[PDB]
Design a protein around this ligand. Structure first.
Ligand code: SF4
Ligand SMILES: [Zn+2]
Ligand SMILES: [Zn+2]
Ligand SMILES: [Zn+2]
Ligand SMILES: [Zn+2]
Lengths: 512, 86, 346, 97, 41, 166, 89, 115, 158
């Protein structure tokens, strides 16, 4: 996981600093270790180690556990560090499904990790004060309503809270508070009757103490998987089937967990009743849609029962496998061409196949199909079974058949995407640091204008800013800006493929 | 029999295929705007702990005028183990 | 005015650290990329080819021709290494036992080791003791390897991880689908029934359907090692700063300077006496060119795998000219001096 | 060289080294087996622990940590041969004090 | 095109003086002249 | 002007054993750090004093006397706000070449911060009128050897009035 | 006492010699060069220069013999010389 | 030449088992010591020719191989020294460079070997 | 026909132009048929049934076109459509047809329809790092570095 460690190092250096990213990389590479050996291996001061650990545990990036002799062991979560790159997508989906209030709520929850309801509503009010104008003021009622609406939809979840120390062995306290979590109050909100109005940042007792919240990345991942499969079935059959599957997934969100081979049994009657009234579709047309989706060669849904009229079930693992197959064939087509993509789909459909059979079924002349096979084998996309006639396994007396292992292919593709995002971040930082002189020049020539904007604003300071030597260099600044924008967009785009690959990898894990 | 090459392959071999143009729309524009805003606003937060400057030259009268003063967040020591108190 | 730079320090060596270099560091260490399978040029005055073997940019071997990299004579030049890129990776004959050990340690699906969290923490605390010696390290490696080989079911993902053994020479095979005398498993049956096309187009698949385990070519084992978590690296008894597991499978070859490969221009005839390592590297480059030509021309997979195995055994002989499982058909004609032969001996 | 006709010198075999060790003559052994036989001066970089030339490290592309060092030429040949075998001896230098 | 001759003379490597008793010159079928000197001490 | 704690290894040859060690050490340190610039420190002037002097070892090699000496030496390094008095030892159209009196010609003030009456027409014209004061701004260091200076810094010229010289 | 100091009678053979010694250089120079060298490279076992074998190989004076102690020159000096006082500080 | 005086009268003289360059005017050496190969390594190293270290001797057709083997057996049945064989194979390789000669019948190659 | 002959193995030379033209024409015909079925909008079942096209139907359509001189048998068009399936652009379903205008398979008949891809190109293929052939040699500090990358420079200049 060298690429993962490098990406985590770059992200931590960009987001939190240098003295903390070293501790983070050490925790990721060496696993769980006590604070003493961490400070010994890192070679820095103890106070900086403590500050790094506290700022990491604040954002729920690392955790601590107790062991023999009461020693505390701190372990980092590389997956949690990788997930923080997906924050803009979380903010976008919470701004799409909700108003901008929930957007700011999730933004503050991600930028602070652990906070109380009063704190987050106060921060949202203070940030929205400058957004609106006309002297009016907002209250905490609508913010609390948006918060509880995010809570019941499981987008936000209460952080693991330390139990009552007075009732749990009142006396000598352990070195670690031993934070635990309860599923009862996981999405419950205690009543906060206090209200107020946010201040406009003029620059001129806690009822919800002990209760901290955080964005539930599991809900965001489930929602993104639902959106992906909806877009897939929309590109496949029609938008009507996409709406049907969106309604059934919305119904299944609550009654199912995040990891299950199939969803709960849903009948066509309740799906029709819960269907939005914007579509003038009858029950027979819905039954036809369901029975044609059941006959799909992709097997996204399944019957799995006949009671209750039309009983149907969806296949989460099969849908994720189909999405991974689509991603793999798309990247193969974009990397090697359409003919190599055809060869890949051929060798993927058939479990095992021979070179002459590949050329016959793919209809490609010699000296090219074998070249594509070799180019695809050199990139760890296929594997040779190599069934031997003799235990000597001599190449002259054995067969060779190509076979695509989707698991290893997805793993290597995820590694390639990680290294690609790392290289993009490195290139962005390089372009930023190589032009830091022009950046400081632009900053000073624009701060000459930023100062005395209103008080003491003479017009004689407007015809000399562009007179500097930075004027012929503005094209370089524009190129740097557009390059940074394109790099960020490419990283965010590869983030969706990373999420798809990670979901396909995790769905087949049983953790047994 | 393969012929002998008098020049090693270039450091950047050319490929006839090019990257697909990036997706456009209000979505990607909002992505860029939000990512830049986060990158900007996260550096001044107290969570972003910069390296402590050292080898301070001298103390001057205008130090209090240029002293970098920022609000310091107090971590909840009830949730944090006792081994991190400064 | 003038920056202060230290002239000379009485430096002494404290200790030697052994390890290996990644392909990137190995490329960075080298200077030029030798791609020509030839030594000298077509001109009559025995001029060595540029970007080829015996190039003077990698040191010098003659008292008259100086080094091109450093402008010094033979008595002053120290030599320079070179890197040779290979189309297909090859198993390192020296670390092949270590490769088999690591493959027995880690899983073939989730890249994790076959060790429980309790035993993981136990071995971590046992290794954290200061002053760990060579014998203690080898004993700990033996104990952990035995405890991992005792288990067969993956504690991380659950996939079956059967025994792994060396078949033939420089070939490793993982027996995932082992022969089960008791009630059979569904996974092995689903695997065996997936050969319908091979059975239809070839009857010999039916008698040879058994013992068709997973042969781990250098590509697959390299891709598996590239995804090893760094947390499990200290548990493999290998130092992380010394090297990485993916560095065990080699993709490049380090051609040594001319100082290790003396050339004697025998003016009595038209010839230059070169060491055996130069001929081995020439044969390796020739095999690389041949396999590239075969990949371009689209030959059969049998010929490709034969060339791959031949390149692997040639690299092994270049490292160690004397092995055990050398087949008699592909045995060397004359005895050569490999690195191991040049190291040991009277 | 070895042979007398090739102007070869005498060889300090294993038993001679054993006798010199038994006598405890550290400086005599150092002068015989290192200074007067295969003495050479190489350049080692204290950062990467590799061998340099003319006070320059091609690996790190720098020359600040490069320092000269006396060494038997056979030891340098051994180090080069081991590096060729992908077995890199990383030499961590230190002050003589 | 013109032949370039470099000198490779046979030298007497001896700590003490020597006297030449006889010099024999022969010619084989390969047109290679063989010259032998009998140094006497 | 500021003191710097330097710990250096000094090798005194045996033919200087008749001399006092506390004098030969100072002489060798002054000869080793004369008109030189320590990286990220500044131009060192001379040895100020010697704090600690441990035992004098003799190595089995060269045989000279090696001593690890702790000392304090003076270096020139402003605090980014110090006022200096330099003399104009030349001037270029892009910046005046003012050199500190007999100390170092490393101060190159850019002509882009005073009031808009700055122009050097290559006739040794310092500044178009409406013992020169100098305000250091930022230090800068670099290396020299890159194949088998380093302290110039910028200068500020604010509206100091300059009643004595324009 | 040498062959019976680890609590077990260890022979002068390569096995007992490897069990009692730690220096990789002498273990490789004795016998079984390739296997020991590759194992040491895999383990990354750093080898010091305490042994006489590596002292002879690396070209440094051995610890045994005259190289055990160190010599100090009796130079006329004054430890901790008088320091010039600070006026401004 | 001399580094100090500039005299170019440097003479090679055999010292006591040592080769060096010294000027006859000031007796100063400019280059001492010479590196020569040992017979212990000479018998180990294999000689390589430019006829093989350039890719040649592999573009030898079966017909050219037959022709050179015919030259060899023809010069061997006559009981000729190996120098005659070397000169004959050199002449054959030189004459085979023409396009009109390489594209011919077996009778032509045989009479060419004879000539 | 296997050892010698064939519509594409003419004179021991592969006919790539003919098979490419046939694939393009079949894809265009299937796309037009699917577009007509979509624009019909009478019923989803009838839309699907009309979007499907039989091998006999497309074979007769190609015969009406008459681009290739050699006779194209039923198995030839079947292999053409199988290659189109392997390209990922069409879908085939085997229905139970006892007897009709096809009569190829006993009690079965293959219907083919043009189908859109599952998902658009991913974000990885939109970056030079994902399509680089020397991606393995990518190092931070070295000869091949992301800082001095030529692929990234050309892609940003586009
Ligand atoms: S050279 Fe640039 S584009 Fe190519 S793999 Fe490396 S970082 Fe990616
Ligand atoms: Zn050199
Ligand atoms: Zn596993
Ligand atoms: Zn270095
Ligand atoms: Zn002279």
């Amino acid at each position: 996981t060298q690429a993962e460690i490098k990406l985590c190092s770059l992200l931590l250096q960009e987001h939190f600093g240098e003295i903390v990213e070293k501790i983070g990389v050490h925790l990721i590479r060496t696993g769980s270790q006590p604070l003493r050996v961490i400070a010994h291996d890192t070679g820095t001061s103890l106070d900086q180690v403590k500050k790094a650990l506290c700022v990491l545990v604040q954002h729920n990036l690392v955790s601590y556990q107790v062991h023999k002799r009461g020693v505390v062991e701190y372990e980092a979560q590389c997956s949690r560090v990788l997930r923080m790159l997906r924050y803009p997508r979380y903010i976008y989906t919470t701004k799409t499904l909700y108003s901008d209030t929930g957007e700011l709520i999730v933004e503050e929850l991600l930028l602070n990790g652990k906070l109380t309801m009063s704190a987050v509503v106060k921060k949202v009010a203070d940030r929205l004060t400058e957004t609106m104008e006309d002297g009016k003021t907002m209250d905490y009622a609508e913010v609390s309503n948006t918060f509880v609406r995010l809570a019941d939809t499981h987008f936000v979840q209460r952080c693991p809270s330390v139990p009552t120390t007075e009732n749990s062995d009142p006396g000598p306290p352990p070195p670690a508070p031993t934070l635990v979590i309860n599923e009862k109050d996981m999405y419950l909100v205690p009543k906060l009757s206090l209200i107020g109005k946010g201040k406009r940042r003029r620059s001129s007792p806690i009822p919800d103490d002990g209760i901290y919240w955080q964005a539930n990345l599991d809900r965001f991942h489930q929602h993104f998987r639902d959106q992906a499969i909806v877009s897939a079935v929309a590109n496949r059959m029609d938008q009507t089937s996409s709406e049907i599957v969106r309604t059934m997934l919305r119904m299944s969100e609550i009654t199912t967990s995040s990891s299950a081979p199939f969803t709960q049994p849903l009948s066509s009657n309740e799906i029709f009743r819960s269907l939005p009234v914007g579509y003038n579709i009858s029950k027979q047309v819905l039954d036809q849609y369901l029975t044609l989706l059941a006959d799909d060669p992709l097997e996204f849904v399944g019957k799995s029962g006949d009671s209750g009229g039309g009983m149907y079930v969806i296949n989460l693992h099969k849908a994720l496998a189909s999405l991974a197959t689509a991603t793999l064939e798309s990247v193969v087509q974009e990397r090697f061409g359409s003919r190599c993509a055809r060869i890949f789909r051929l060798v993927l459909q058939k479990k095992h196949i021979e070179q002459k059979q590949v050329e016959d079924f793919a209809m490609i002349p010699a000296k090219e199909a074998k070249d594509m096979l070799y180019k695809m084998l050199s990139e760890n996309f296929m594997s040779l079974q190599e069934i031997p006639k003799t235990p000597d396994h001599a190449p002259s007396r054995t067969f060779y058949l190509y076979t695509v292992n989707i698991l290893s292919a997805a793993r290597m593709l995820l590694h390639r995407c990680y290294k690609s995002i790392a290289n993009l971040i490195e290139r962005r930082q390089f372009e930023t640091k190589e032009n830091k002189r022009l950046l400081e020049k632009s900053q000073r020539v624009e701060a000459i204008i930023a100062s005395m904007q209103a008080t003491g604003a003479e017009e004689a300071q407007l015809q000399e800013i562009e007179e500097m030597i930075t004027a012929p260099e503005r094209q370089q600044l524009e190129t740097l800006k557009r390059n940074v924008n394109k790099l960020d967009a490419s990283e965010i785009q590869v983030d969706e493929t990373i999420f798809l690959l990670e979901s396909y990898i995790e769905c087949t894990m049983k953790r047994q | 029999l393969p012929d002998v090459v008098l020049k090693p392959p270039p450091l950047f071999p050319d490929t006839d295929y090019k990257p697909v143009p990036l997706k456009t729309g209000e979505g990607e524009e909002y992505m860029l705007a939000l990512k830049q805003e986060l990158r900007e606003t996260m550096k001044r937060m107290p969570y972003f702990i910069e390296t402590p400057e050292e080898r301070q030259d001298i103390e001057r009268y205008s130090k209090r005028y240029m002293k970098v003063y920022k609000e310091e967040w107090i971590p909840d020591w009830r949730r944090l183990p006792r081994e991190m108190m400064p | 005015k003038e920056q202060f730079r230290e002239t000379d320090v009485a430096k002494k060596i404290s200790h030697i650290c052994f390890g290996m270099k990644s392909p990137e560091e190995m490329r960075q260490q080298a200077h030029i990329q030798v791609v020509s399978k030839n030594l000298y040029s077509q001109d009559n005055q025995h001029a060595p080819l540029l970007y080829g073997v015996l190039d003077h940019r990698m040191g010098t071997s003659e008292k008259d021709r100086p080094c091109e990299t450093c402008g010094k004579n033979l008595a002053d030049c120290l030599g320079h290494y070179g890197y040779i890129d290979l189309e297909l990776p090859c198993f390192h004959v020296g670390y092949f036992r270590a490769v088999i050990g690591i493959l027995q340690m880690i899983c073939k699906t989730c890249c994790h080791i076959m060790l429980s969290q309790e035993e993981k923490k136990q071995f971590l605390d046992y290794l954290k003791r200061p002053g760990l010696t060579y014998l203690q390290k080898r004993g700990l490696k033996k104990k952990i390897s035995d405890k991992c080989r005792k288990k067969n079911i993956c504690h991380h993902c659950g996939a079956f991880n059967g025994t792994v053994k060396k078949c033939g020479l420089l070939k490793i095979i993982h027996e995932k689908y082992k022969t089960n005398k008791k009630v059979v498993d569904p996974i092995v049956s689903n695997f065996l029934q997936s050969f319908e096309t091979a059975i239809e187009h070839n009857k010999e698949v039916e008698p040879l359907l058994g013992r068709a385990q997973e042969n781990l070519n250098p590509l697959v084992v390299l891709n598996l090692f590239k995804r090893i978590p760094a947390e499990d690296v200290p548990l493999l008894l290998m130092n992380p700063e010394a090297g990485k597991p993916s560095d065990l499978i080699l993709t490049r070859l380090l051609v040594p300077p001319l100082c290790i490969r003396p050339s004697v221009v025998s003016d009595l005839k038209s010839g230059t006496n070169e060491d055996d390592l130069t001929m081995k590297l020439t044969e390796i480059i020739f095999l690389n060119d041949v396999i590239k030509k075969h990949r371009i021309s689209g030959a059969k997979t049998q010929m490709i795998m034969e060339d791959w195995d031949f390149l692997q055994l040639q690299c092994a002989l270049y490292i160690n000219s004397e092995l055990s499982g050398i087949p008699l058909n592909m045995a060397p004609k004359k005895w050569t001096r490999g690195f191991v032969q040049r190291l040991k001996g009277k | 060289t070895e042979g007398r006709s090739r102007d070869g010198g005498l060889r300090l075999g294993e038993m001679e080294r054993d006798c010199l060790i038994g006598y405890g003559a550290s400086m005599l052994l150092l002068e015989r087996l290192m200074i007067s036989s295969d003495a050479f001066e190489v350049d080692v970089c204290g950062q990467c622990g590799l061998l340099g030339y003319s006070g320059w490290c091609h690996y790190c592309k720098s020359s600040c940590h490069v320092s000269s060092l006396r060494i038997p030429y056979a030891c340098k040949l051994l180090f080069q041969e081991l590096q060729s075998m992908n077995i890199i001896p990383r030499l961590k230098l230190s002050k003589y004090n | 095109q013109q032949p370039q001759y470099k000198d490779v003379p046979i030298t007497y490597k001896g700590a003490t003086d020597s006297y030449i008793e006889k010099v024999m010159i022969s010619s084989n079928a390969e047109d290679a002249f063989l010259i032998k000197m009998l140094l006497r001490q | 002007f500021v003191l710097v704690e330097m710990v250096d290894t000094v090798r005194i040859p045996p033919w200087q054993f008749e001399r006092k060690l506390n004098d030969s050490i100072a002489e060798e340190l002054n000869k080793k750090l004369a008109n030189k610039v320590v990286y990220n420190v500044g131009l060192c002037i001379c040895l100020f004093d010697i704090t600690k002097l441990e035992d004098a070892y003799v190595f089995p090699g060269d045989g000279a006397s090696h001593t690890k000496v702790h000392f304090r030496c003076v270096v020139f390094h402003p605090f980014l706000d110090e006022i200096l008095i330099g003399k104009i030892k030349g001037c270029s159209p892009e910046g005046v070449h003012v050199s500190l009196g007999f100390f170092d010609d490393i101060l190159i003030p850019p002509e882009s911060l005073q009031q808009p009456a700055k122009f050097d027409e290559a006739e040794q014209v310092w500044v178009w009128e409406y013992g020169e004061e100098i305000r250091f701004r930022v230090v800068d260091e670099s290396f020299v050897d890159t194949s088998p200076y380093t302290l110039v810094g910028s200068i500020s010229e604010p509206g100091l009035g300059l009643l004595s010289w324009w | 006492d040498l062959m019976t100091y680890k609590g077990e009678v260890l022979g002068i053979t390569r096995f007992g010699l490897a069990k009692m010694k730690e220096s990789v250089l002498m273990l490789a120079s004795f016998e079984k060069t390739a296997d020991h060298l590759f194992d040491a490279a895999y383990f990354g076992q750093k080898d010091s220069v305490c042994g006489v074998s590596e002292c002879i190989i690396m070209g440094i004076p051995m610890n045994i013999g005259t190289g055990l102690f160190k010599l100090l020159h009796k130079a006329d000096r004054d430890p901790n010389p008088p320091k010039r006082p600070l006026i401004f500080d | 030449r001399c580094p100090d005086c500039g005299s170019t009268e440097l003479v090679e003289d055999s010292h006591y088992s040592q080769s060096q360059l010294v000027c006859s005017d000031c007796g100063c050496v400019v280059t001492e010591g010479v590196l020569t190969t040992t017979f212990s390594d000479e018998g180990n190293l294999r000689e390589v020719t430019y006829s093989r270290s350039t890719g040649e001797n592999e573009q030898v057709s079966r017909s050219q191989q037959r022709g050179l083997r015919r030259v060899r057996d023809l010069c061997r049945v006559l009981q000729l020294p190996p120098t005659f064989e070397d000169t004959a194979v050199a002449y054959y390789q030189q004459a085979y460079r023409h396009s009109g000669i390489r594209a011919a019948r077996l009778q032509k190659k045989e009479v060419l070997v004879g000539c | 026909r296997s050892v010698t002959g064939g519509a594409w193995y003419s004179d021991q030379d592969f006919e790539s132009e003919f098979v490419e033209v046939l694939n393009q024409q079949c894809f265009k015909f299937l796309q037009s048929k699917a577009e007509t079925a979509r624009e019909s909008k009478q019923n989803p079942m009838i839309q699907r049934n009309s979007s499907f096209a039989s091998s006999h139907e497309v074979w007769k359509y190609i015969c009406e076109l008459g681009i290739s001189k050699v006779e194209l048998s039923m198995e030839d068009i079947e292999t053409i459509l199988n290659t189109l399936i392997y390209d990922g652009k069409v879908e085939m379903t085997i229905i139970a047809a006892k007897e009709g205008t096809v009569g190829s398979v006993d009690g079965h008949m293959k219907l083919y329809r043009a189908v859109n891809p599952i998902i658009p190109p991913t974000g990885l293929v939109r970056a030079p790092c994902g399509l680089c052939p020397v991606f393995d040699d990518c190092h931070e500090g070295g000869e091949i570095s992301p800082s001095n990358c030529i692929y990234m420079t050309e892609w940003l200049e586009f």
